[PDB]
């Protein structure tokens, strides 16, 4: 028996994986303080928890830095996404939208809305989303408007090449484009108060 | 000397330099590789802000050093 008609599922499973993978990423056995506060943060579009200053980058980088050899998912990690999403078999199309999606979700992390501010932005944050992207990219690069897109967001994240910064735009440009392109899949993973 | 330059955000850089460079012309030789403007690079090595006017051997900075690059990122 199915409890919520087929268009609302995606109401219900979207936030148990998206907390699935917080607990991927934020290990309760050593970040609990940290999990709590990546899952709390999903109940509102906007924190007054910010997550910019020293120590915050410095909680981050320990928590982020072995997900991303080399600025990159790592291989075990990928494989912990494709888990997670049920996405071990899925096509490459798939799997490139549900990334960029989550790129999507950490860019907004990364926000001014949520852990950012006006001025500073969690590094640590934009690069995963970035690699998140990169990952799409390299999965299925149709889904992107163009290499030129691909590469003015990318030097967003990083601050590359005189590229603007602001994640909350950048957030809402990949959000736009998702929900132009795969609305369904992107419902799939957004918080449902980021949406 | 070969040295590698990495953003918080994960991106690295490899440059060529002699221990005689000084700061601002690493800062020079980031905007050629990838164009972030020299006033808002800030490096960091051995959590020391590193001065425009010194060189990389006054904060002996050896071959395949890794310093870090803190930019402004507006959320």
Same mark, same amino acid.
């Given at each position: 028996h199915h409890h919520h008609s087929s268009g609302l599922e995606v109401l219900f499973q979207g936030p148990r994986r998206f907390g699935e993978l917080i607990d991927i990423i934020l &290990? *309760?056995?050593?970040?609990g303080e940290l999990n709590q506060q990546f899952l709390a943060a999903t109940n509102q579009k906007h924190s007054t928890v910010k997550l910019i200053d020293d120590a915050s980058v410095s909680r981050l980088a320990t928590i982020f830095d072995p997900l991303l050899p080399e600025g990159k998912l790592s291989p075990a990690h990928y494989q912990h996404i494709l888990s997670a999403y049920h996405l *071990?078999?899925? *096509?490459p199309q798939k799997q490139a939208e549900t990334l960029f999606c989550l790129s999507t979700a950490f860019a907004r992390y990364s926000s001014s809305a949520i852990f950012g501010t006006e001025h500073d932005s969690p590094p640590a944050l934009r690069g995963y989303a970035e690699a998140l992207m990169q990952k799409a990219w390299e999965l &299925?690069?149709?889904?992107?408007? &163009?290499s030129e897109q691909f590469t003015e967001w990318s030097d967003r994240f990083h601050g590359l090449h005189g590229a603007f910064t602001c994640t909350s735009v950048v957030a809402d440009s990949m959000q736009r484009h998702a929900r132009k392109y795969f609305p369904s899949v992107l419902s799939s993973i957004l918080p449902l108060a980021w949406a | 000397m070969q040295i590698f330059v990495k953003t918080l955000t994960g991106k690295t850089i490899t440059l060529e330099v002699e221990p005689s460079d000084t700061i601002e012309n690493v800062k020079a030789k980031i905007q050629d590789k990838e164009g972030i403007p020299p006033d808002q690079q800030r490096l960091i090595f051995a959590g020391k802000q590193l001065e425009?006017?010194?060189?990389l051997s006054d904060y002996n900075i050896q071959k395949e050093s890794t310093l870090h690059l803190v930019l402004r990122l507006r959320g």
């Amino acid at each position: 028996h199915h409890h919520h008609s087929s268009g609302l599922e995606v109401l219900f499973q979207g936030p148990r994986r998206f907390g699935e993978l917080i607990d991927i990423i934020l &290990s *309760t056995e050593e970040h609990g303080e940290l999990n709590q506060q990546f899952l709390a943060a999903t109940n509102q579009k906007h924190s007054t928890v910010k997550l910019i200053d020293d120590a915050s980058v410095s909680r981050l980088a320990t928590i982020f830095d072995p997900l991303l050899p080399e600025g990159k998912l790592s291989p075990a990690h990928y494989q912990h996404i494709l888990s997670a999403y049920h996405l *071990t078999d899925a *096509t490459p199309q798939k799997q490139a939208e549900t990334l960029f999606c989550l790129s999507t979700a950490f860019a907004r992390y990364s926000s001014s809305a949520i852990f950012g501010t006006e001025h500073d932005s969690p590094p640590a944050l934009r690069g995963y989303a970035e690699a998140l992207m990169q990952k799409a990219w390299e999965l &299925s690069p149709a889904i992107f408007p &163009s290499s030129e897109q691909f590469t003015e967001w990318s030097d967003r994240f990083h601050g590359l090449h005189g590229a603007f910064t602001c994640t909350s735009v950048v957030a809402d440009s990949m959000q736009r484009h998702a929900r132009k392109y795969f609305p369904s899949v992107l419902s799939s993973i957004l918080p449902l108060a980021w949406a | 000397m070969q040295i590698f330059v990495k953003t918080l955000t994960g991106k690295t850089i490899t440059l060529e330099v002699e221990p005689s460079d000084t700061i601002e012309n690493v800062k020079a030789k980031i905007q050629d590789k990838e164009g972030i403007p020299p006033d808002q690079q800030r490096l960091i090595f051995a959590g020391k802000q590193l001065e425009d006017g010194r060189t990389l051997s006054d904060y002996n900075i050896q071959k395949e050093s890794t310093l870090h690059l803190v930019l402004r990122l507006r959320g």
